[PDB]
């Protein structure tokens, strides 16, 4: 009875942090520097350099791993992944978690959101 748990969003089911945590994927020290970029508000992530053949389905098993996906939105007609995580640092982790990661023979990209 799994149905649809991940890739969701709510109110009484957020903030799942904890002490002692420094995995190989992403680290804290390599995140605080990113958070400084944008203000403590913008959550929309950014992962440019995406191949036209980039199915969101294959993107789930990558972003959701970093933090929590509320309403991830793919942009095939542009070239960039927009993830409005629940927390600021959350999405920011995706910028220091991949940054030119091996997807399918192409060096992806990273960045922040909020155009205005």
From Swiss-Prot:
Subcellular location field: Cytoplasm; Nucleus; Cytoplasm, P-body; Cytoplasm, Stress granule
Domain RRM: 43-115
Superkingdom in the source lineage: Eukaryota
Assembly and oligomerization: Interacts with NAB2.
Function of the molecule: May be associated with hnRNA within the nucleus and remains associated during nucleocytoplasmic mRNA transport, once the proteins are in the cytoplasm, disassembly of PUB1-RNA complexes may occur prior to PAB1 binding and formation of a translationally competent RNP complex. Binds to polyadenylated RNA; prefers to bind poly(rU); binds to T-rich single-stranded DNA.
Additional free-text comment from the UniProt record: Present with 49600 molecules/cell in log phase SD medium.
Protein name: Nuclear and cytoplasmic polyadenylated RNA-binding protein PUB1
